[PDB]
Amino acid sequence: NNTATLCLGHHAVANGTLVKTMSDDQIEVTNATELVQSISMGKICNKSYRILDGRNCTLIDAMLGDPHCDAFQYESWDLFIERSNAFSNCYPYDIPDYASLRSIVASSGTVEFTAEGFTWTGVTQNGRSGACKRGSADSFFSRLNWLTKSGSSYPTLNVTMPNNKNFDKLYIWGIHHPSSNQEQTKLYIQESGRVTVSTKRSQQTIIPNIGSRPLVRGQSGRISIYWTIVKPGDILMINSNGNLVAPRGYFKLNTGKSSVMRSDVPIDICVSECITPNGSISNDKPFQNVNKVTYGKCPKYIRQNTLKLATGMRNVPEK
Amino acid sequence: NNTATLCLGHHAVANGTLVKTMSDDQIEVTNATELVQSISMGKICNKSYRILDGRNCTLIDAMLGDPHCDAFQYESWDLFIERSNAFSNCYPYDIPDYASLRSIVASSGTVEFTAEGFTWTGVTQNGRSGACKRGSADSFFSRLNWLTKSGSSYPTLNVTMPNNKNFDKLYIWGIHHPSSNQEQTKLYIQESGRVTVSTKRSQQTIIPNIGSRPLVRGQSGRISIYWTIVKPGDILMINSNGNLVAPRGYFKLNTGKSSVMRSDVPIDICVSECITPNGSISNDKPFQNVNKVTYGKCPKYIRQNTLKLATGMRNVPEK
Amino acid sequence: NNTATLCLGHHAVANGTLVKTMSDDQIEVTNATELVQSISMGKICNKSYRILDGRNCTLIDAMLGDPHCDAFQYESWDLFIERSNAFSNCYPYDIPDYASLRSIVASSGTVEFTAEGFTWTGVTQNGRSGACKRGSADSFFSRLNWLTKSGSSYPTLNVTMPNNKNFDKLYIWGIHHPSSNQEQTKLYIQESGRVTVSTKRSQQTIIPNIGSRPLVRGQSGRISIYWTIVKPGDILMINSNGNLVAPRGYFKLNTGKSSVMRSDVPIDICVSECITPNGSISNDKPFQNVNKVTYGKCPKYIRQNTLKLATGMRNVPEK
Amino acid sequence: GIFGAIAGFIENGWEGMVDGWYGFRYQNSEGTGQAADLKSTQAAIDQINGKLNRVIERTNEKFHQIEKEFSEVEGRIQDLEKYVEDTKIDLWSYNAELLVALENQHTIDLTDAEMNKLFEKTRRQLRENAEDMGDGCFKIYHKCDNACIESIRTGTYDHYIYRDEALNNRFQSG
Amino acid sequence: GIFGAIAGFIENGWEGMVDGWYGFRYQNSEGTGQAADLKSTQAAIDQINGKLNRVIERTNEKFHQIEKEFSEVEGRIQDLEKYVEDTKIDLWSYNAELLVALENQHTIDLTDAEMNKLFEKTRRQLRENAEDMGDGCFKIYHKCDNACIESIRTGTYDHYIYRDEALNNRFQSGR
Amino acid sequence: GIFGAIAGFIENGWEGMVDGWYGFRYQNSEGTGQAADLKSTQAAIDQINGKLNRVIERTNEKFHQIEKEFSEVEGRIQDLEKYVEDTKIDLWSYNAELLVALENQHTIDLTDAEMNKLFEKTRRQLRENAEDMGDGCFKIYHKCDNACIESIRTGTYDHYIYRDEALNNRFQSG
Ligand SMILES: *[C@@H]1O[C@H](CO)[C@@H](O[C@@H]2O[C@H](CO)[C@@H](O[C@@H]3O[C@H](CO[C@H]4O[C@H](CO)[C@@H](O)[C@H](O)[C@@H]4O)[C@@H](O)[C@H](O[C@H]4O[C@H](CO)[C@@H](O)[C@H](O)[C@@H]4O)[C@@H]3O)[C@H](O)[C@H]2NC(C)=O)[C@H](O)[C@H]1NC(C)=O
Ligand SMILES: *[C@@H]1O[C@H](CO)[C@@H](O[C@@H]2O[C@H](CO)[C@@H](O[C@@H]3O[C@H](CO[C@H]4O[C@H](CO)[C@@H](O)[C@H](O)[C@@H]4O)[C@@H](O)[C@H](O[C@H]4O[C@H](CO)[C@@H](O)[C@H](O)[C@@H]4O)[C@@H]3O)[C@H](O)[C@H]2NC(C)=O)[C@H](O)[C@H]1NC(C)=O
Ligand SMILES: *[C@@H]1O[C@H](CO)[C@@H](O[C@@H]2O[C@H](CO)[C@@H](O[C@@H]3O[C@H](CO[C@H]4O[C@H](CO)[C@@H](O)[C@H](O)[C@@H]4O)[C@@H](O)[C@H](O[C@H]4O[C@H](CO)[C@@H](O)[C@H](O)[C@@H]4O)[C@@H]3O)[C@H](O)[C@H]2NC(C)=O)[C@H](O)[C@H]1NC(C)=O
Numbered sequence A, B, C: 001n002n003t004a005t006l007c008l009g010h011h012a013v014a015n016g017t018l019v020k021t022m023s024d025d026q027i028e029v030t031n032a033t034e035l036v037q038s039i040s041m042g043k044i045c046n047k048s049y050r051i052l053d054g055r056n057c058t059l060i061d062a063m064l065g066d067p068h069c070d071a072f073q074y075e076s077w078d079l080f081i082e083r084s085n086a087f088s089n090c091y092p093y094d095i096p097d098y099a100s101l102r103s104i105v106a107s108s109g110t111v112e113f114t115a116e117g118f119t120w121t122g123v124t125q126n127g128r129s130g131a132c133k134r135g136s137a138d139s140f141f142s143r144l145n146w147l148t149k150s151g152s153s154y155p156t157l158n159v160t161m162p163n164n165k166n167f168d169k170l171y172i173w174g175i176h177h178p179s180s181n182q183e184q185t186k187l188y189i190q191e192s193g194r195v196t197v198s199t200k201r202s203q204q205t206i207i208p209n210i211g212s213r214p215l216v217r218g219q220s221g222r223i224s225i226y227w228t229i230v231k232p233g234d235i236l237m238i239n240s241n242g243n244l245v246a247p248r249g250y251f252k253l254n255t256g257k258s259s260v261m262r263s264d265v266p267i268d269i270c271v272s273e274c275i276t277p278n279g280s281i282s283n284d285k286p287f288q289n290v291n292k293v294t295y296g297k298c299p300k301y302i303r304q305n306t307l308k309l310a311t312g313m314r315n316v317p318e319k
Numbered sequence D, F: 001g002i003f004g005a006i007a008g009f010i011e012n013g014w015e016g017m018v019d020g021w022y023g024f025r026y027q028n029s030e031g032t033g034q035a036a037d038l039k040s041t042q043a044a045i046d047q048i049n050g051k052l053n054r055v056i057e058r059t060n061e062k063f064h065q066i067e068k069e070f071s072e073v074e075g076r077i078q079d080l081e082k083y084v085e086d087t088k089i090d091l092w093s094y095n096a097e098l099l100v101a102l103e104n105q106h107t108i109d110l111t112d113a114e115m116n117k118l119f120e121k122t123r124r125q126l127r128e129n130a131e132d133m134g135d136g137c138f139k140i141y142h143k144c145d146n147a148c149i150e151s152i153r154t155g156t157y158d159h160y161i162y163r164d165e166a167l168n169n170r171f172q173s174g
Numbered sequence E: 001g002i003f004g005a006i007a008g009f010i011e012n013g014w015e016g017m018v019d020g021w022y023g024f025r026y027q028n029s030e031g032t033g034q035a036a037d038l039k040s041t042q043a044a045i046d047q048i049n050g051k052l053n054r055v056i057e058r059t060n061e062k063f064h065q066i067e068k069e070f071s072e073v074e075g076r077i078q079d080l081e082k083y084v085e086d087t088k089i090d091l092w093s094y095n096a097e098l099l100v101a102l103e104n105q106h107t108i109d110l111t112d113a114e115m116n117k118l119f120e121k122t123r124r125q126l127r128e129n130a131e132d133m134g135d136g137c138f139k140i141y142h143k144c145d146n147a148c149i150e151s152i153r154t155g156t157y158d159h160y161i162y163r164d165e166a167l168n169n170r171f172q173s174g175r
């Protein structure tokens, strides 16, 4: 022409997404990105972390030595998975602070037992029960040693075991609770029983509890578990005139990345770095809405299930 | 003229309000809004939420069956209120882990009791005391049954109670500590007592400790309370050779919105969706500074008692 | 020139500092300021707060009356510093729920001790041992009273001590577990002893537990410690037929700004309003990366070590 | 605030305007007169209504929680119960202070913007035919009756029609 | 739109602009033509890239934690384990809702700025050889061919060259 | 920043100005000279001073809290004490990261504004008698001595006075 004209402007698209700002609740922009992980992978993934599958075993059953948990005997892990359909099948027990001992063992990352030469003179060892079957007939927890009378007596046991290693040992032991006053004397002569486990720094004495209970695998007796930690330089000592269920050794305790998690989801071949009861989840988003229980490199769990972050300008299609 | 003069401007007000921005500590704007509730209604409002005035009774008393708590016998609540002039008027007792039992009962949201047919062959029932007095006569906790010997022997009790329902039952029971040994033998033949309450999964045995304690309502002896949760499919079993304070039945343990709160503030016909020890408070404001202890659709407690959000422009009166 | 050029400009400096905005990762500004405190002073500063060097004493040995803590009898503090190489040099002992007692005492800010006229009739008092030594002679915990039999009888003790003051009294007491039946019967006539520390509102029975422990300062026996809070208007009654380690009085609790802290840092003449286990730190920054453990007017602990805040405009040098 | 419009190149507000938030004051052939602009008034109001709801979730029911006041001295668990509670209050208090601070910051600049935008919008209409006096105020170099001023507010002011007139009034100086 | 560039004096965006975000369209003595501005497009994208990484940190590896689901009613410890997690989750939910809001508020008005800055930059080149039409658009009062239009985009436009031609074309009017 | 003044249409900053943050540089019949506008400098200084005070509370006294380091393995209670502590520190670390970023983002944008505010303030003062050259630099079309420049800085300029003079010089072309 005689003169010219120059016009400025920005671009736009077809598929504008709505997002939230401080000035408006909804507003169209050229692109947006999802910040909350809603979808899980629907399977727990055997990489990058090491995971053990509890299957029929709970963690405490595996580390005590339930006959149907002999496959776990030598296993360590990054994450142990407890299935809900899991059960016990050995002598009926209880553990004061079960939750704590579960945490302490779950953290260690292993149930690998070290045997040690304990000497129980004047008593008879390796007691078994019809509740706790292995192969055919009677058996017992493989990490505990049920001590009964030898002939006419059960003399006071007084056995010492020093810790010259450079690491904290964890001894597991228990006490037996006979059904009746008739059992208490039949097994461990003395009308009353007692177990006093002590180190230089602390102690626990536990009295038995004669009484009839409901039947579990034909048995009305029970057994209680206590644990005791022995430090480097320190020394384990066990005094008892009856009802002791002795340790056969110690578990090594570890500062570790290990843990335990309840889930009923199948473990599959794949690679992933965050785990929830719902399965593995993708790592890449900063937040997540699958589960507040997470193990590994996990986005933070939040109550929202969608938060769109704007990665583009305002979108004005031609009106 | 041949020249108009068009002018732009904005509005102002008689008196604006100071607010705080990132740029300034104080600055006038045309209208602000208080974002923090300072004031309470003065009383607790009985609408929206079902509230139960505990008056002279504490929650645990109302469930143990304290003779001055008979009004609460059949009651349930959204929020139980404990007045701090409340007391107990019954047999002097304590509860190992009182705090938890309270919280459990509180959450359950009811003290609705269900009688079960227990049989206590061998022993005399419904023991009473000068401490609890229903009317003028000697009585005892409604939900407990005090068993002493019948004739001249207290034979070992061994009584089972299955749970065929689909919910968890909660049994309250206790053991009784007499003052002297002349009293220990007089009530229950045996010179030493025991109560072993057990299930398939857990079990507990308590030994009565004989000895003088401070006098409360004439009584030097005392009673310790314990609970036991019996799961669906599970089975209760009470075994004891002396000193048992037996259950009469069980409480239904509920999952609910129920709780308990301490307050000496009165109650009134009035609607509100928050409660505090100070009284019901308004809901509209997002933050609050009346009390950290709250129940209901409650705004967040903070430490500042005033915060102004501007809802108008900067107010510039004539310079 | 019939004209004049007038230019506007901003200033700039010869040492532009890099900061982080929402737009940019690293952008240069005329001036910054540090927000996180990286370094301590390396010494704990004893002007401002009255701080107390534990030296060879732990907080608990100090109040029990360990011979080498004699100098702490009449002390009080805002912060008690526990050196890690502190030790005990008294009868070997354990405290169930030790941390709680340590926290309670730390919050009190003193180990001042009021004596009281307890009458222990028919029992010999002030029993000493080889482990606690006052100078060369044998001794014992100074705030505790080891009671053994007199003649050949240890009757049931039943001692009352009413609280007529208007504050809560802490009573520390213990039970002694001997090494063998032969030791038990020699000191306390009875084959098995007991202690019941009761009040109107609660109670606490402890049975001892014969048996060998490891040698500590030539002693296989052990003492356990318990505490009891007697509210004002209440009354403390002690009932025991053997093995009691009785109190000589009470500690007065004071709801206060007092605490304890573990650190092996020196204590200098110096000023600060905040203390960490790394020594006092500067109080003027909003944040701090020295230690999560702090005490006093002290900035927030965060993971990051440096955060730079812009205190000036953008620095643009001549290109 | 930042645009230099409110409390900046506009000396002060107009208390005598209850019509709206932004508006006009014109002196012309038919005396004087005042008006309001309800597009700019609406545009600010809309952003300030529900300003807080875009951040704070509508209050959620909380029922049985932990205990936060104690009659007894229990040691360890009571320490923890207290520390949890205080951690939460300190964190929410800071949240509350910071939210108020920058939501207000925004409210100030949002409003200041709308003024500038209106000024500029009406400036770009006038084009050659007017002058920015610095009062946030225009000197128009031609005769606008009230239907003329109407057109500038509706947005239908044709600048090419008055351009000739505008220049003869503009140019007569040397 | 605090500047009123996007969704303001620019009526709408160009759905046929593939090359950049911001740009030019023109018409001159060689017909119509389109171009993108890379300086402004890169300026906005450099701010939007890793926008979130400047605030929220490289996700950290978390291992053994408290239990957060219970199968057994047990009073005060459980009730605390619940309150600890429930407090956490609410505090994070708020942070996320807040961050997204103000981080989006930033992105919107940051892109609006570039548009306004691009406009004032070219307006300051044309000086008095052109006229803002209110349209986010100019009437340049001289013949400006495709080489001359490039001179505006690249920023080397010497206005003194066309100044005399600019005034002839502007003033042809009195009454 | 967003106004495009600093590191934008103004090419760079001036190390030779220690009189203030913002200021002028002029050349006329009486040679060259620098100045400083203390009004703007004082405005920005006042917004930045006590910047952090307005959001984070004055530091507060903390006495006996929970334990955060353990010499012994315990499990459940120690698990909880550590999770509380971990939770707390993650949240504060986040809150510090965010604060710094957005407080600075703000600190950059209000300094940029106060540059542009000054530009527009002086542009609106000169009306017809000057021209924006692109550099954030005006060519004035008349004989302006220092008393006249003074009147521009202090805000007492008179464009009606210099108008006739401005127009002759301005239009020596066609
Ligand atoms: C205190 O009180 C409790 C409860 O009353 C008593 O405990 C019960 O004791 C009885 C008798 O010993 C137990 O019954 C026995 O156990 C098995 C029954 O359980 C099986 O069948 C049921 C359903 O019918 C299933 O639920 C379960 O899974 C089992 O499969 C049987 O094995 C026993 O029967 C066999 O032995 C008898 C005896 O000679 C034979 O005649 C039969 O042919 C058969 O082969 C028997 O029934 C009962 O289970 C116990 N209950 C509980 C809850 O423990 C204590 O005995 C009591 N203590 C005292 C009095 O000191
Ligand atoms: C271990 O040690 C404790 C402490 O000594 C003993 O318990 C005390 O037992 C004595 C009896 O031997 C109690 O004395 C009696 O107290 C009754 C209650 O009095 C209090 O309560 C009333 C309310 O009814 C209030 O008015 C007031 O506050 C009182 O403090 C009195 O009713 C009794 O009075 C009767 O006897 C006295 C003569 O002694 C005369 O006044 C009249 O005859 C009257 O009818 C009596 O005073 C004492 O209260 C108990 N104290 C505590 C803390 O329990 C244990 O018995 C002891 N155990 C042993 C040795 O085995
Ligand atoms: C249950 O089992 C335990 C462990 O086996 C027994 O406890 C041990 O008992 C023995 C015998 O009493 C103790 O042995 C004695 O220890 C004393 C002190 O131990 C020191 O050891 C070295 C010495 O070089 C030091 O470095 C260390 O720090 C200790 O100080 C020694 O003094 C004894 O030796 C001799 O000392 C005197 C000095 O005058 C001599 O005159 C004597 O001849 C005497 O023999 C001796 O070594 C042993 O220490 C105990 N160990 C533990 C861990 O308790 C229980 O007795 C047992 N209970 C039963 C069977 O009921």
Ligand SMILES: CC(=O)N[C@@H]1[C@@H](OC2O[C@@H](C)[C@@H](O)[C@@H](O)[C@@H]2O)[C@H](O[C@@H]2O[C@H](CO)[C@H](O)[C@H](O[C@]3(C(=O)O)C[C@H](O)[C@@H](NC(C)=O)[C@H]([C@H](O)[C@H](O)CO)O3)[C@H]2O)[C@@H](COS(=O)(=O)O)O[C@H]1O
Residues within 6 Å of the ligand: A127, A128, A129, A130, A131, A138, A146, A148, A177, A178, A179, A183, A187, A218, A219, A220, A221, A222
């Ligand atoms: C019908 C009847 O009464 N039959 C007699 C048996 O009594 C019972 O049947 C058994 C199978 C069981 O279900 C009981 O509940 C029932 O009363 C009796 O059998 C013995 O009963 C005792 C209990 O008194 C034990 O159950 C015992 O079995 C073991 C076990 O398998 O668990 C044997 C095991 O080696 C033993 N372990 C030890 C000593 O270390 C345990 C242990 O004692 C308990 O677990 C401790 O709580 O018990 C079972 O064999 C027999 C007589 O047997 S006995 O040895 O003389 O007692 O006689 C039947 O006629």
Ligand SMILES: CC(=O)N[C@@H]1[C@@H](OC2O[C@@H](C)[C@@H](O)[C@@H](O)[C@@H]2O)[C@H](O[C@@H]2O[C@H](CO)[C@H](O)[C@H](O[C@]3(C(=O)O)C[C@H](O)[C@@H](NC(C)=O)[C@H]([C@H](O)[C@H](O)CO)O3)[C@H]2O)[C@@H](COS(=O)(=O)O)O[C@H]1O
Residues within 6 Å of the ligand: B127, B128, B129, B130, B131, B138, B146, B148, B177, B178, B179, B183, B187, B218, B219, B220, B221, B222
């Ligand atoms: C003035 C005087 O001394 N009178 C004698 C009474 O002694 C005493 O009074 C009682 C309340 C108490 O304070 C004593 O310390 C005081 O010396 C005596 O009263 C009996 O004393 C006994 C034991 O000392 C009990 O206190 C008993 O009260 C009950 C009670 O209400 O708690 C009766 C109740 O039916 C019973 N419960 C049962 C059997 O299940 C309880 C229970 O055994 C205890 O609480 C143990 O936990 O005891 C009270 O009656 C009177 C009556 O003597 S009697 O022959 O025992 O009845 O004798 C005066 O000489």
Ligand SMILES: CC(=O)N[C@@H]1[C@@H](OC2O[C@@H](C)[C@@H](O)[C@@H](O)[C@@H]2O)[C@H](O[C@@H]2O[C@H](CO)[C@H](O)[C@H](O[C@]3(C(=O)O)C[C@H](O)[C@@H](NC(C)=O)[C@H]([C@H](O)[C@H](O)CO)O3)[C@H]2O)[C@@H](COS(=O)(=O)O)O[C@H]1O
Residues within 6 Å of the ligand: C127, C128, C129, C130, C131, C138, C146, C148, C177, C178, C179, C183, C187, C218, C219, C220, C221, C222
């Ligand atoms: C080699 C040998 O057998 N020597 C005999 C000593 O036995 C022992 O040596 C002591 C130091 C210790 O290491 C023992 O484990 C070792 O067998 C024995 O010496 C004593 O041992 C007894 C216990 O067996 C006591 O330890 C006692 O000392 C005290 C003490 O200081 O702790 C004396 C103190 O006055 C007393 N306190 C009281 C009564 O309140 C305590 C207290 O009973 C216990 O600590 C409670 O647990 O014990 C010490 O004498 C002596 C025999 O001494 S005896 O006392 O006349 O019997 O004989 C050596 O041949």
Ligand SMILES: *[C@@H]1O[C@H](CO)[C@@H](O[C@@H]2O[C@H](CO)[C@@H](O[C@@H]3O[C@H](CO)[C@@H](O)[C@H](O)[C@@H]3O)[C@H](O)[C@H]2NC(C)=O)[C@H](O)[C@H]1NC(C)=O
Residues within 6 Å of the ligand: C031, C032, C033, C311
């Ligand atoms: C750039 O910023 C830095 C750091 O903020 C400036 O250094 C600081 O300057 C302040 C004054 O603005 C000094 O204040 C002094 O503080 C002490 C507190 O003990 C007080 O007693 C004095 O009366 C005085 O107010 C402070 O010393 C100093 N801080 C540090 C860590 O160096 C710097 O001066 C600024 N530079 C420019 C060019 O503006």
Ligand SMILES: *[C@@H]1O[C@H](CO)[C@@H](O[C@@H]2O[C@H](CO)[C@@H](O)[C@H](O)[C@H]2NC(C)=O)[C@H](O)[C@H]1NC(C)=O
Residues within 6 Å of the ligand: A031, A032, A033, A034, A311
């Ligand atoms: C719009 O946003 C999406 C999602 O944020 C972008 O997709 C990215 O594409 C790259 C491949 O270049 C992938 O590595 C990422 O997985 C995606 N997400 C990112 C970078 O956060 C996409 O680039 C955008 N699309 C358009 C047309 O701009």
Ligand SMILES: *[C@@H]1O[C@H](CO)[C@@H](O[C@@H]2O[C@H](CO)[C@@H](O)[C@H](O)[C@H]2NC(C)=O)[C@H](O)[C@H]1NC(C)=O
Residues within 6 Å of the ligand: B031, B032, B033, B284, B311
């Ligand atoms: C000043 O602003 C306050 C708060 O924005 C106004 O009060 C609310 O106004 C909204 C919006 O119209 C109404 O829905 C509510 O009913 C008002 N109440 C509350 C508690 O927020 C108020 O109208 C304004 N005051 C004046 C005098 O203009």
Ligand SMILES: *[C@@H]1O[C@H](CO)[C@@H](O[C@@H]2O[C@H](CO)[C@@H](O)[C@H](O)[C@H]2NC(C)=O)[C@H](O)[C@H]1NC(C)=O
Residues within 6 Å of the ligand: B055, B056
């Ligand atoms: C709580 O208890 C007190 C004292 O036991 C009650 O006051 C008595 O009430 C009874 C009737 O229930 C009267 O016979 C007495 O005259 C009252 N005595 C005193 C000293 O007040 C009080 O009423 C009870 N409160 C509630 C809400 O039940």
Ligand SMILES: *[C@@H]1O[C@H](CO)[C@@H](O[C@@H]2O[C@H](CO)[C@@H](O)[C@H](O)[C@H]2NC(C)=O)[C@H](O)[C@H]1NC(C)=O
Residues within 6 Å of the ligand: B038, B277, B278, B289, B290, B291
């Ligand atoms: C609500 O009531 C509580 C009691 O539940 C009041 O608590 C007192 O607050 C004062 C404030 O100065 C303090 O001295 C004490 O910490 C409290 N004393 C007691 C005896 O509890 C509280 O002040 C009330 N709050 C409001 C906002 O009214």
Ligand SMILES: *[C@@H]1O[C@H](CO)[C@@H](O[C@H]2O[C@H](CO)[C@@H](O)[C@H](O)[C@H]2NC(C)=O)[C@H](O)[C@H]1NC(C)=O
Residues within 6 Å of the ligand: C055, C056
């Ligand atoms: C705390 O502990 C040590 C070891 O018991 C004390 O011992 C030392 O200092 C003494 C001076 O009186 C010496 O006689 C000791 O031989 C010496 N031992 C060692 C290993 O250094 C020390 O004095 C005590 N400190 C305090 C403050 O009581």
Ligand SMILES: *[C@@H]1O[C@H](CO)[C@@H](O)[C@H](O)[C@H]1NC(C)=O
Residues within 6 Å of the ligand: A015, A017, A030, A031, A032
């Ligand atoms: C919009 O469309 C393109 C088409 O390929 C796609 O790649 C892009 O990711 C889409 N964006 C959104 C937010 O849907």
